[PDB]
Amino acid sequence: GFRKMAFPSGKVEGCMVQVTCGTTTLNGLWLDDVVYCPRHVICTSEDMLNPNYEDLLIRKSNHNFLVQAGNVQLRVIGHSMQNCVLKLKVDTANPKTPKYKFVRIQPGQTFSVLACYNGSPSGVYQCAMRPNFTIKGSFLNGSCGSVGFNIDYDCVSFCYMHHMELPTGVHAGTDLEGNFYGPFVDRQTAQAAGTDTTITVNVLAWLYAAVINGDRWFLNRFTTTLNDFNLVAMKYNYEPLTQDHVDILGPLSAQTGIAVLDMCASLKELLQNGMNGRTILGSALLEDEFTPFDVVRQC
Amino acid sequence: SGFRKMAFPSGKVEGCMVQVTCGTTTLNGLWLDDVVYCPRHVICTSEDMLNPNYEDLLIRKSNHNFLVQAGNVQLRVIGHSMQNCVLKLKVDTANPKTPKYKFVRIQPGQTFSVLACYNGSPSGVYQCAMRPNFTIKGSFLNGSCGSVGFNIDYDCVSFCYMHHMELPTGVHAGTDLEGNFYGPFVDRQTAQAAGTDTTITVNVLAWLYAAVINGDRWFLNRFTTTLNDFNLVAMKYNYEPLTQDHVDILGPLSAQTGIAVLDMCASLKELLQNGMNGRTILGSALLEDEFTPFDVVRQCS
Numbered sequence: 093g094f095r096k097m098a099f100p101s102g103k104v105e106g107c108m109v110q111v112t113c114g115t116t117t118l119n120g121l122w123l124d125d126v127v128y129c130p131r132h133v134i135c136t137s138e139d140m141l142n143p144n145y146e147d148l149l150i151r152k153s154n155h156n157f158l159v160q161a162g163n164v165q166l167r168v169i170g171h172s173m174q175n176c177v178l179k180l181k182v183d184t185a186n187p188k189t190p191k192y193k194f195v196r197i198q199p200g201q202t203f204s205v206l207a208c209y210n211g212s213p214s215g216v217y218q219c220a221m222r223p224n225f226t227i228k229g230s231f232l233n234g235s236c237g238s239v240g241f242n243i244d245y246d247c248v249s250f251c252y253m254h255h256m257e258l259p260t261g262v263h264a265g266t267d268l269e270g271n272f273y274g275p276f277v278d279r280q281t282a283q284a285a286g287t288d289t290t291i292t293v294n295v296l297a298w299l300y301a302a303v304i305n306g307d308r309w310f311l312n313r314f315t316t317t318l319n320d321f322n323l324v325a326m327k328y329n330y331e332p333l334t335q336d337h338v339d340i341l342g343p344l345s346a347q348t349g350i351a352v353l354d355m356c357a358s359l360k361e362l363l364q365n366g367m368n369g370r371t372i373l374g375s376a377l378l379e380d381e382f383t384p385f386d387v388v389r390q391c
Numbered sequence: 392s393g394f395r396k397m398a399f400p401s402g403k404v405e406g407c408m409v410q411v412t413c414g415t416t417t418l419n420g421l422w423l424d425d426v427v428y429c430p431r432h433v434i435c436t437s438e439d440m441l442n443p444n445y446e447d448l449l450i451r452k453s454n455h456n457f458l459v460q461a462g463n464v465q466l467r468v469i470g471h472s473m474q475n476c477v478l479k480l481k482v483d484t485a486n487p488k489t490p491k492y493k494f495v496r497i498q499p500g501q502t503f504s505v506l507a508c509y510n511g512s513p514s515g516v517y518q519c520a521m522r523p524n525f526t527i528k529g530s531f532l533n534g535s536c537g538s539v540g541f542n543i544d545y546d547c548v549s550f551c552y553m554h555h556m557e558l559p560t561g562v563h564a565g566t567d568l569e570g571n572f573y574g575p576f577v578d579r580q581t582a583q584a585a586g587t588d589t590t591i592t593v594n595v596l597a598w599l600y601a602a603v604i605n606g607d608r609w610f611l612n613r614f615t616t617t618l619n620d621f622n623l624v625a626m627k628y629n630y631e632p633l634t635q636d637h638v639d640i641l642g643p644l645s646a647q648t649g650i651a652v653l654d655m656c657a658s659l660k661e662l663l664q665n666g667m668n669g670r671t672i673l674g675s676a677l678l679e680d681e682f683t684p685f686d687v688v689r690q691c692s
């Protein structure tokens with residue numbers, strides 16, 4: 093009765109196009125009369141190692157950009173670069189443009205990813221922005237320009253554009269202004285991330301979800317102060333819990349009658365002992381990519 | 392592990408969702424060409440639901456009793472019929488967003504995307520696996536019936552599931568788009584029991600192939616087995632027996648890795664009989680059974 097759920101992707105599918113420079117093809121986002129895509133589309137082989145993007149860009153003309161919306165080519169009539177994103181002005185407005193905004197998400201927030209190849213949507217799944225500003229996605233060659241988003245009412249909030257895969261197999265990208273999340277650079281180099289930590293407010297949300305669906309073997313009669321919980325959390329590379337996090341979990345504490353700090357005491361015990369080979373909502377590991385909102389919406 | 396439960400993009404299905412109301416009962420329907428498909432229990436009074444007389448309830452109905460809306464725009468109903476547990480409402484407008492589509496009946500172990508909808512409005516999309524006992528582990532609230540499950544092959548939407556009910560154990564049951572239930576369930580507000588569930592062997596094998604493709608291959612042994620010997624062992628561990636179709640849908644992964652299906656079965660047999668002994672596969676001591684062979688090839692390649 094509790095599932096990792098992506099937003100319906102139709103409003104975003106109608107914006108995906110294919111963008112090609114030379115031998116490099118990736119995806120773009122077509123909103124009104126502008127197509128947004130990762131700037132490294134303008135790179136060749138030799139370029140990707142250490143590209144001077146302003147240099148590469150000035151040597152380009154509008155006609156070197158091949159933009160295809162399905163079996164239809166769009167004419168590029170202007171281009172500009174904003175940080176690591178290229179903006180291609182085309183002569184046709186996308187009639188399928190939804191109401192939208194560009195947002196920069198905070199670590200610990202979640203969003204849906206519409207993975208695309210050759211301008212064609214291929215799959216949708218939920219991701220969290222990690223505390224170390226990576227995301228644990230599923231992206232292959234040609235996925236760059238795939239976007240992450242949330243939907244509030246009629247409005248699509250774009251928060252992520254995909255650019256790279258790190259050697260550990262996690263992923264890195266930018267907001268739609270082209271600024272990376274995290275200390276990464278769009279060059280073909282092996283980059284390591286900062287130490288990742290676990291999103292504690294999300295683990296607590298998920299534990300509450302497991303209680304709602306009747307799995308409460310992990311609960312206990314003990315309790316803890318906020319600070320004492322945070323000392324243990326930090327020891328185990330969990331993010332500290334703020335009073336705003338406690339407030340945000342209110343609805344779930346109300347719903348289940350379990351005080352936030354009582355659930356913290358359960359989590360502390362799990363951190364110190366393990367799951368004894370047991371499972372919670374099917375998982376052998378503590379899940380930290382469900383926000384309190386994600387849980388509430390769905391229960 | 393490197394693997395995500397990934398749904399299909401839902402847009403082609405979003406363009407087909409409507410709502411269908413009888414009296415105060417509203418659920419979701421599927422609008423393809425000039426027909427709307429929905430669960431027949433929309434015609435139930437909350438008091439008719441203990442053991443509804445669907446044929447009698449339908450006889451009293453006329454086209455003008457059904458309120459079909461795409462958003463808030465009414466779609467006029469011009470004909471109605473019942474096919475097993477689904478109602479078919481002929482409407483006077485062909486859906487301009489109708490995709491290329493088919494109606495397919497899936498087998499246990501197969502996965503599909505669910506577009507969870509309320510009042511004809513999509514709320515979320517997620518991947519489900521049909522369990523061997525013909526339940527799915529969904530996330531459905533009141534008003535979700537008529538939500539559909541589907542796969543997309545190139546441009547074509549294969550609709551395989553329509554949602555009708557929840558079981559006491561928290562799992563979910565429903566029909567294909569011809570209204571035939573998966574499993575032994577019926578659309579009555581009664582407590583019904585799923586058979587004990589079992590592990591989807593073919594998908595575990597796909598998972599082991601996935602592990603091999605990614606270089607995690609400690610569990611490969613030097614032996615093989617017959618299919619019958621493997622199946623008799625597997626049942627003692629509450630694993631499903633393999634069918635010939637299971638062996639065939641493992642073909643591509645077998646060819647990609649050069650590991651014969653029956654050799655992988657012998658490796659799985661040893662894992663069942665000996666446990667993992669503290670080891671992991673794809674970063675987990677638990678074997679995953681909700682990725683099909685198609686799903687593995689989707690994400691790896």
Ligand SMILES: *[C@@H](O)[C@H](C[C@@H]1CCNC1=O)NC(=O)[C@H](CC(C)C)NC(=O)OCCSc1ccccc1
Pocket residue numbers: 118132135140231232233234235236237255256257258259263277278279280281282283
């Ligand atoms: C999209 O163009 C593509 C998406 C990745 C391909 C594999 N999975 C992906 O997420 N992006 C890239 O290939 C990156 C292009 C750069 C930004 C110009 N490059 C990238 O991710 O390279 C791999 C980094 S790890 C590495 C690099 C060098 C040597 C060893 C390891």
